[PDB]
Subunit: 282 residues, 6 copies
């Protein structure tokens, strides 16, 4: 059976940027087919409607098993309109978002939607005097390192791989939809790291990453004096850079014990596992 | 006047992943509107045709001024199908690709296509024993850091901003389409870095990134013994990690002189410029 | 004139450890004389009363111009007794504390006490399974680096040097007593750093150090499962370690421009200033 | 059974700064009670005398089992007065000092004093043109890191804990007083590091720290031209900063093996021990 | 029996610089005696003939078992003259060189010469505007780190130790002469590294080192505009600096597992082996 | 005129290993010609006599203007024999050595010999259990980095370039011969570093490097228990590794200001100078 999904991307988060690719890292899965649509970085209600409309138009002929909407702040006007359209639709849907999405977590459950809210997927320092395209990309690189090397992306991979398997025995029910909130403490319930200091360095990374969001918000939405807000937003980016270095330190620790967890997909979609470098994944 | 474009993403490159977002880094441009479609990681001919078809379907109503196709290896069967379908459409089109795209550079010119071929946008170590989703994301984080902090993304940003300006006075002709090959030596014709060591560090980063591709190719397509190819692909990833460190080093040098170039967009899409941290961009 | 003060140390904070020594870094000031008393790490009401009583007993013959009480949490039972005793006494007094001291800020003003509340002076991960003497000392080393290299200790130095000068013209009144709250944003009102990236790195360090306190508090007072709280408190120490790296990075940036601010005391107590390595302080 | 001690602190050493705190790292020991008195950084005879007087004064009511004097250069005039007064008193006493103390080691034996002479507890670069309060604090941060992560502070904790246990059966004789000289080679007789490379790095750190003293002495007491002495004393601080990095590297090697020794006190004062992160100390 | 050899050094390579010393690292071998002659950095035909004539002049009385010629580019005019002269002589001879020596590999076999060609022994950025004595030495320090810490020097040591053993059993034949080409992939056939990430980091270092040569060649021999060639040659040196960092990182990983391979010579020349720091070599 | 010299190398020092190559870094000097002879690492009296005899034999035809003997410890039996032979000869001679050479400094002046004694050129940890060929090469890489990046090699370059120019006007007299002792404080009389922190970091590196020798000497010649001497010699190597890192940091600070001193030779042997990366040396 081939599971089918549409991913809708409006605005940008680290998680929404990678979410589809985490499911087919070598493009060799024979049990999935995806379509990805969006309006790039714009996430006003008009653009989001356009994005969802594209999805639903494609869905008529594509017949996806589920639809994923990903981007910043599920509580905002654009995303709320996506939640409304997708909840109304015939397709099971999952909302990928960040910490501001916690405001509408009960509402999403009421709407019959799944969610994965990634608290460390922090808003960047979006002031013109600081954030140009290069800086935006630098931040995203650091963030992606954090989300990957800490194990957060493996949490997201697993949630969708479970959903996909349910899709393969058809009708995914509301009870099958992910309802996850990911943060520093998520690592406490997992066995990502063989070395306890790699895990605590990864937790520190995630804490810092989550703390970045409040600094960005202060600099973007509260502070009005540029002599203050430019340094504030830039400090958030320095924090993210060091979160990434901690994530890197954690991963090097694992390397030192030849204990880096890898969980690749087989061509039939089965999630394999290994820890030793030269061990075949099984 | 609002420029419209559709971006098509099949497969993954560092450049293709970021290309649309580099043009509207704070989502505050009023002079652009984009649609993004694709088939995620899959870039076989059937997937690519489905992607291009989605794009052209949307184009009927959206009326883009140009269309961008981005992904690995323009010379491969899937991308070759996109090039012909795009070349045969009524829309001006640009192909974003990597070093393997040089093999069809003359063909693309004959097809009346633009291109941006990014030689440091190197193929990763795509063997199951090594590349899981997390490793894939870690590699992409390092690469993004390289392409951003070396100034490659600014080269791309500028090529598209120039094209967008032409789109607004409307007559985008073949002569207007970008025809760029980016590598280490690209930096020699730019003024990215105030500090010359920053520039040479960045050139080293790009050279290393470019050399990554040959290691990955050997590991994925030539070497057939896993006791050899797993170490080979893994070594490519260690190289990219150090390319990203050099890119970071270069950026910190610019910080030490308060000379980090920032070129943000104004709401009307004008590209602004600054070097000093507290200087307003203009 | 020779200014005289008694410093009372109950419990440990980075600022209270160093506060007296910041005022006479080479022991060559001829205009000050200090006594230091305390009960080491213990700050229960009984110990604190014993400490303050030692101070007041010495004060009879020493005749200090002011008395400083330093240590964790001004709102806690032990420190609350010291505030009560000092507010009752004839001596002007200043309370050095941390962020939990904010709860009794208005109370302290009503008591006629000065205060310097250092938000980044974060509680450590005080769980027996993790915190041994060596770890305690390690954390203190990281914290002292942060508070020093970010400029916090210069803010404290200044506040006391001003108070000392007022002591030297007799009338220390309640209006002369410091009323400071120090955090990340304190740097925005200062000219500590010649380089703006050094400043924002230092801000990031202070932000992280401040965030350490919440992690420690969660791990020490809220989380009851050791499988959880041991990793949590450890992760707070990993964060502090990186805050110290950031502060180091900032100082090295200043080195690179030969612009490290130094403000040493002359033998008569005047605070001198220099930036250039070979420049005489004046 | 509660052991009581008074600590006297005149001038500043890394070891004297932390000595009392290393004995009750979470303030939960129920078998100890301490008083700490001193004259801050000043250690001329009249200051040290005042300090010892405060101690003896408090002793009459407090009834300590022993008295500890800590600070620079036991052979200097001020500390020599402390040694004389303490030797003459009815209280067992221990002198904490640095390498210059070796000159009066036999004398202290003849006086019936204990001692802990810490050779890597190096004098800093005390020239006005270089040493302000911030630099002094940064040097202290690096030294504290060195003495803590090398295991020197654990040698000190143990000496005192053995002494405290003897105090609890009343019979502290002169034969029970510590007589330690601590340097790089001290690590060879210890079991501190599971990893041999961590041990040798720690050894290297302590060697560099010890050698700092010679550079400081040269810069402060021999060289008289500021064009030479300012760079000399600064070079000493750069050495200490790298000694601290070596000690941190060693600690990170222990974390890679999950073998970081921790020896926390129980509430009853028993010294517990563990290596694995998640294991209870016993 | 005492094996005797003459080493001829014209020009400089990392391998030629160290080759003799790798065979008697503490000068305590009783079974070898070497002479070293050369013309320093100059390797034009006239200089090389002079060097070889010095060797053969000494060889008349010294009676070496073999002769080694080491320096850059076996295929160049100077080295070609050394090959011809040595092939003609009565003495078995080995040519140490770099990747450009591959062009005359079959020729060397035909001449009855041995060779060790070290591809990562890359030409430096020899342009007057960049390469001064200090820069040359810095590059050599980085290269030496690479060749040593990756295990390349161990491969060279082994090759000569085998040849020396054959020298000691009177007859060296043409079949005993080494015929080695060393690169990144050489490590795949060895057991240098206990940790697989140390191995792949060492492979990355060797790959980058080998890629340096192409950048140097482009900068020295192809690019004729100084505005371009100076940055190009400089970027080659930045690449070798990071190759050395990777090599260092690999060695530290081995330290973290107490697994650093050591193969010292015994006084009788036997090559011993150990991994554990405190294990006697045997 | 073409100046001629013979370099004799017996044993190994960082300075002796590089000394001839520092004088002709690109092999393009037309005003010098060198011969290099030696007995590799062996420096017992018979070996050294053989070495010097080779040199004198060559000198009869080569007619050098001066002769350089370089290697460890001028005061040892082997080197003392070279000094005697060279002093007796018709050729001006310079002795390159290390700190132990200071013992025979006056003797060398009485002999009419020049010397360059490099105190930071420290003996390594030559115990079989630790020092294999690889470790020997690693140490030499670190030492070379220290001697190069601190500017020590530039001091040696200049001393020989002066002597060479005097050789070109026939009169090499005893007064012309270098008489240098190089150590940390040598930097104070130079203008090597534009940045004063680069200088002090370099001074720190040289201090540490010089301190290495005492540790090596303790481990190789005093300590007799291998449980002690193996760690001791290994710690010396850890120290040299950090000295190299300090030297690296110093050089990077110079890069951050575009102020790296370069002094290349012109083809006529004139020593040029520049600081800015893109400025021609003059
Ligand atoms: C593509 C980016 N990529 C991302 N990627 C990740 N992984 N996470 C993110 O989060 C990502 N981003 C978050 N976004 C984002 C963008 C904007 C805001 C809103 C913005 O912060 C507020 O509108 C400011 O008030 C704008 O300031 C204005 O006022 C100032 C003065 O202007 P005048 O001169 O008075 O006129 C000036 O600073 C100007 O900018 C919030 C979030 C980006 C779309 C988006
Ligand atoms: C999403 C990834 N993200 C990217 N992102 C960036 N910025 N750049 C890239 O470049 C990115 N990736 C490049 N891609 C990619 C994928 C595949 C290949 C081709 C692949 O390497 C070959 O088919 C291998 O031979 C597969 O080996 C097979 O054989 C082995 C034995 O297996 P058995 O059990 O015997 O059967 C085993 O290793 C197995 O994998 C090349 C490139 C990904 C789509 C894509
Ligand atoms: C000297 C240290 N130095 C400092 N230095 C700085 N610059 N900043 C600080 O802040 C500094 N420290 C803060 N202190 C500190 C000490 C304790 C707490 C409070 C403590 O965390 C709570 O009482 C825990 O709940 C007790 O844990 C207990 O429960 C567990 C056993 O459980 P069972 O077996 O069920 O029974 C075990 O983990 C045990 O420890 C708060 C702060 C230290 C004095 C003090
Ligand atoms: C709080 C510090 N904390 C410490 N902490 C640790 N862990 N270790 C130490 O070791 C610590 N310190 C050691 N101390 C210390 C202080 C002074 C000296 C002595 C000082 O070096 C000599 O008196 C200089 O001759 C004074 O230089 C003078 O002469 C120069 C000319 O000035 P003009 O304009 O001609 O008049 C100028 O540079 C000036 O300073 C030695 C040690 C500090 C108390 C103390
Ligand atoms: C001692 C060095 N040590 C080594 N060590 C190692 N481990 N590996 C090496 O590889 C090592 N080196 C290789 N060597 C080396 C030397 C020269 C070239 C050839 C050189 O690059 C060409 O001749 C340039 O054309 C010279 O350019 C000239 O032209 C420019 C002036 O132009 P205008 O104004 O028109 O007049 C200026 O840049 C000038 O230099 C190649 C290799 C050194 C001997 C040697
Ligand atoms: C090529 C090296 N490269 C250099 N390069 C630089 N830039 N600087 C140097 O300095 C450089 N090295 C210094 N050299 C050097 C060599 C030896 C010693 C003397 C050596 O340390 C003593 O003879 C040991 O006692 C030998 O110990 C023996 O005793 C033990 C046997 O025990 P059992 O069980 O009783 O049997 C064992 O550890 C064994 O080694 C001093 C210096 C090398 C030539 C030379
Ligand atoms: Ca056409
Ligand atoms: Ca007195
Ligand atoms: Na597992």
């Amino acid at each position: 059976t081939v599971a089918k999904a549409i991913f809708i991307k409006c605005g940008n988060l680290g998680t929404s940027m990678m979410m589809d690719m985490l499911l087919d890292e070598r493009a060799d899965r024979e049990d999935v087919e995806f379509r990805v649509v969006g309006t790039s970085v714009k996430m006003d209600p008009e653009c989001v409607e356009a994005a969802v409309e594209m999805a639903l138009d494609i869905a008529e002929d594509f017949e996806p098993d589920f639809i994923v909407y990903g981007g910043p702040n599920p509580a905002a006007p654009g995303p709320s309109k996506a939640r409304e359209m997708l909840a109304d639709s015939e397709y099971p849907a999952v909302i990928i978002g960040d910490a501001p999405g916690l405001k509408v977590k009960d509402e999403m459950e009421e709407q019959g939607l799944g969610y994965i809210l990634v608290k460390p997927d922090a808003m960047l320092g979006a002031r013109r005097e600081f954030l140009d395209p290069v800086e935006m990309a630098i931040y995203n690189a650091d963030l992606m390192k954090v989300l990957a090397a800490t194990g957060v992306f493996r949490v997201v991979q697993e949630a969708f791989d479970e959903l996909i398997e349910k899709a393969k025995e058809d009708e995914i029910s509301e009870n099958d939809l992910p309802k996850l909130v990911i943060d520093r403490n998520t690592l406490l319930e997992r066995e990502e790291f063989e070395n306890p200091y790699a895990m605590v360095k990864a937790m520190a990374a995630l804490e810092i990453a989550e703390n970045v969001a409040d600094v960005s918000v202060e600099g973007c939405f509260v502070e009005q004096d540029k002599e203050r807000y430019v340094p504030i937003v830039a400090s958030a980016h320095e924090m993210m850079r060091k979160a990434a270095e901690l994530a890197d330190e954690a991963r090097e620790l694992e390397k030192s014990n030849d204990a880096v967890l890898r969980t690749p997909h087989a061509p039939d979609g089965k999630v394999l596992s290994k820890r030793k470098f030269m061990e075949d994944p099984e």
